[PDB]
Design a protein around this ligand. Structure first.
Ligand code: CA
Ligand code: CA
Ligand code: CA
Ligand code: CA
Lengths: 594, 594
């Protein structure tokens, strides 16, 4: 009809926040006389703006039960009836579990994991009408069905959650594959699936014991989003809708020496030309985006959101967002991308930050990029008597007083924006670093994330561009020669790697010591880093030898974490003797239980 | 007589704390019956310990006026009268000025600055009976008279304070030159001068407008200190008087993951065999040391103490110490050596630390070693569009939210424990780095310290040992060929360096903008770092070009700190045009006033 788009698509009765903003987009609709035909719904307000193609409606749902109702636009002789549903909430929707340190997240770029339906690789009408598996920056045809097809593999690997790069539609001319330029916040990308397919994926994942986390982006949308292409008003995007390039200097939010000029350039600046910057200080923009997040939580049953670009957005509005989400879903977890150089500035973004006080982001989980930088060097260097190697871990962790909630820090070796743990295929010839890094990651504090393909030694270097950071999982396509979803088609080394991660993950799942236990560590001792996780009377103890050589060490230092004269290494299932001294082969790892 | 040592030597009437501990050392004195012959002084308590050579007396002075009085030991037939003075306080002793960001401190190692009295280079009876100017680790003969002789030079350089490495006596066999193994807390080292000489030095310094800061060490004394050689009890030193070597891991005080074993080894461990670790948890040790600090403040009129090794000592006792000092001298400033790798752990030691809360060190000033590390690389590297060079300064300073009192951070390029700013004589051929580093140091936030000899390009590298970090000031000895205290005997380059520092220092002195002003800075712009200090309506603006090349930059970013279309560079006294763009020669520095 005259109505092109209605947002949200639908809503629910009995949400904690009883307000509903319905955004209407169509042909010169703004002059219309608006009414409702409904049962116990109040139309509070109709908002008109420069662009006559939009109306913004504010409804009060406090007294309203599930129902179908009509929005009615009368313009002279013409009358349009827009039907609208208030669905009935699942029981206990509010009580959906979040994710936490008991979990391990498996990060998947949908377009690059598995093609389970080739018929949707190209969608008539969409601006990017091409797939080309040999172009790193083109669509390759991955989809939701593909992920659904391989849930068995993911669960068997031992992770507890899938985390998806953005699945919301990116109808862009170029670069649509990655998902970070959304053109519709209320639709899965038609090349990945329908909305229903995503709900089904989540159901299927939950039934195999897997949580689902979803990437969302409030800082910016794609330039082909109707909201941008046909702006309601200049106030919806920063710099009044004109492209000004961001500096990426997000330290300006908290830097005590920041300039006014630089704060504006950073936080109001656009990431690129085709990713215009939302003005989150606009009440309509903010509610639109907030509602979008809540919609996907109610509709799809997700356990988590990662808000990319969190520091590039208005601080106050993102605090309101986190508050509004947690008011509706008290156990839900949100992680923000805090890509900064140091723990000090990252800690500011975490909920209850001592350094932000009295400001509070309300953001439960932030990302430990500094730990990533250290872990990418700590297993390759010599650990001397004074410095290097595993000292990086000792020294970094001892600074955890900065962080308000250290067990709500996402930890990771890499992700879709970094070099992979192994930079090149050639580097994967030695798995020592892999084994130490993952032992550390999966036993120390925080919430681990594994990037898809880590478990089969996929390699990549940032210097060759972002496209090759996100190569196709070998096996995800019908015509792939080697299908690495099955052990039978994997190199010996790939199976060594896969089996190692799986051992740790399968052991970690359900393990209350790692999930909730105190942490206690010791300075590297003749190159050997030792630490303990301890919950009640159960404990775990890790030894990591930080050198390419045999080392004997005195065990007297560790008396307070060694309650018995021997224990079993979980990895080799062999006994380790704990009496006075211990000799550790080159790059040894012991993971003891007590 | 039978009394070898009395501590303190004397005291004052009308101190805020009315308690006085008098420690008596002699031949089997502990059985004695003790009394006083005095006017309105109460002997509260006499403390006996394992060693019979000691008595500890506690007196109450609350009702007591200045007087001479006697302590009386009666043992059978023998009776010893120990005379003791309660001096009368100078008026306004309490109100002695501290030091602060309006100051610049000039750090001097006394044995290596100037020999103004060669007759005291060797002192009969002292265990180290040798001087040898050609041995880096031997005494060279510097003294107080030498510093007094060159106060004119120091004041003319433009600094506001002298800071001395320890002047308390180090009667040790080897290594006595540096001062960090004290054998008498109540005596200046006889090779430097008498107590009176130090008081005179201070008087002389004050009259030329210079403050005096004194190094003290509570963590440890020298193994030839009577307190150690002939211990009152095993409880006076950690590990019951037995040598156990410290790990140097002082992060154990605040590390949330610290072990019990490691905390003890670090904080109770000895620095070396000949530097035994005081047990500051012993009430007698603590009062002894506290009183010693207060004594030198009353007696000598000093403005500041640097407590070396502050983190190796008991946290609670050092907080009590800072409180007790500030209760007596409210404006006095104490700086603690916080030699740690990062701002997080350093910030814990600063008074009102948000990360230590609810603990509080009460330590006003801490040392910004991380800024030093950055400054030793920031002026040598390329400053690209994204990273390197002057970015190190931008990035470090933006983390100042960690610090409770950023203007009470001691900043410095080097000191007696580091490589000098210039590692070798050859490196001093280029002064660009010197000029940028010192411009930065003397205009940015904090309390600058210059190490003696920096102003004449003395060079040294840590790798050649500590002795060559502390070479003789050329001119401090009667037989030196080139006397660099006078411009006439200096290389052209030495005079370029000296004149540059002097210009900045002389301009900084009295300058309220630098002392008290806000700081505002900008990300390096095509390699050029720019910042402003601003107090009321007066401001200062620095431009530092962070590359070995000419660069034109847009000035539009800086509109908010450029209130006029031109200004005068303080350094070259030439006009700089502030209109739309600015072209900066290789390594340019502009220091503008408005
Ligand atoms: Ca497909
Ligand atoms: Ca923004
Ligand atoms: Ca002398
Ligand atoms: Ca100690």
């Amino acid at each position: 009809s005259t109505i092109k788009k209605v947002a949200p698509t639908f809503w629910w009765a009995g949400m904690k926040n009883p307000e509903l903003q319905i955004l209407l987009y169509g042909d010169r609709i703004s002059s219309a006389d608006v009414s409702l035909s409904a049962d116990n719904i109040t139309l509070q307000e109709v908002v008109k703006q420069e662009n006559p193609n939009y109306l913004v409606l504010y409804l009060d749902l406090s007294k309203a039960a599930p129902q179908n109702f009509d929005i009615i636009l009368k313009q002279g002789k013409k009358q349009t009836k827009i039907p609208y549903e208030l669905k009935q909430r699942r029981p206990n929707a509010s009580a959906v579990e979040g994710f936490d340190s008991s979990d391990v997240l498996y990060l998947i770029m949908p377009d690059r994991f598995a093609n389970g339906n080739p018929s949707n690789d190209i969608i008539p009408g969409m601006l990017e009408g091409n797939v080309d598996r040999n172009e790193p920056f083109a669509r390759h045809g991955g989809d939701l069905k593909g992920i659904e097809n391989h849930l068995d593999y993911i669960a068997d690997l031992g992770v507890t959650s899938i985390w998806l790069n953005p699945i919301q539609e990116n109808d862009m001319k170029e670069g649509s594959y990655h998902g970070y330029a959304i053109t519709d916040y209320y639709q899965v990308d038609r090349r990945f699936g329908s909305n229903e397919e995503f709900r089904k994926l989540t159901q299927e994942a939950n039934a195999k014991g897997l949580k689902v986390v979803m990437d969302m982006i409030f800082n910016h949308c794609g330039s082909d989003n109707y909201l941008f292409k046909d702006m309601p008003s200049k106030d919806w995007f920063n710099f009044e809708g004109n492209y000004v390039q961001t500096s990426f200097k997000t330290a300006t939010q908290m830097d005590p020496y920041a300039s006014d000029y630089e704060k504006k350039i950073a936080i109001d600046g656009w990431f690129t030309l085709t990713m215009p910057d939302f003005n989150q200080r606009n009440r309509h923009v903010a509610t639109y985006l907030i509602q979008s997040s809540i919609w996907w939580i109610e509709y799809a049953g997700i356990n988590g959101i990662r808000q990319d670009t969190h520091p590039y957005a208005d601080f106050d509005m993102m605090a309101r967002w986190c508050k509004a989400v947690n008011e509706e879903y008290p156990k839900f977890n949100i992680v923000g991308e805090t890509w900064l150089g140091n723990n000090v500035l990252i800690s500011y973004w975490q909920k209850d930050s001592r350094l932000a006080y009295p400001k509070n982001s309300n953001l439960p989980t932030v990302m430990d990029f500094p730990l990533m930088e250290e872990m990418n060097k700590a297993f390759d260097e010599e650990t001397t008597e004074w410095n290097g190697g595993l000292f990086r871990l000792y020294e970094y962790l001892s600074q955890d007083i900065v962080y308000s909630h250290p067990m709500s820090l996402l930890t990771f070796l890499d992700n879709h924006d970094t070099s992979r743990f192994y930079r090149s295929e050639a580097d994967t010839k030695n798995l020592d670093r892999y084994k130490q890094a993952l032992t550390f990651l999966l036993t120390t504090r925080g919430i681990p994330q594994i990037y898809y393909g880590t478990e089969i030694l996929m390699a990549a270097d940032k210097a060759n561009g972002d496209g090759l950071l996100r190569c196709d999982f070998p096996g995800g396509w019908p015509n792939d020669t080697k299908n690495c979803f099955d052990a039978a088609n994997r190199t010996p080394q790939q199976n060594e790697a896969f089996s190692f991660m799986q051992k740790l993950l399968q052991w970690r799942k359900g393990n209350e010591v790692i999930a909730k236990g105190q942490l206690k560590h010791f300075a590297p001792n003749k190159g050997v880093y030792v630490y303990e996780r301890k919950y009640g009377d159960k404990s775990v103890v890790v030894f990591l030898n930080g050198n390419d050589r045999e080392q004997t060490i005195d065990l007297v230092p560790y008396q307070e974490i060694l309650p018995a004269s021997s224990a079993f290494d979980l990895l080799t299932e062999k006994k380790v003797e704990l009496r006075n001294e211990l000799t550790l082969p080159s790059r040894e790892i012991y993971l003891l239980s007590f």
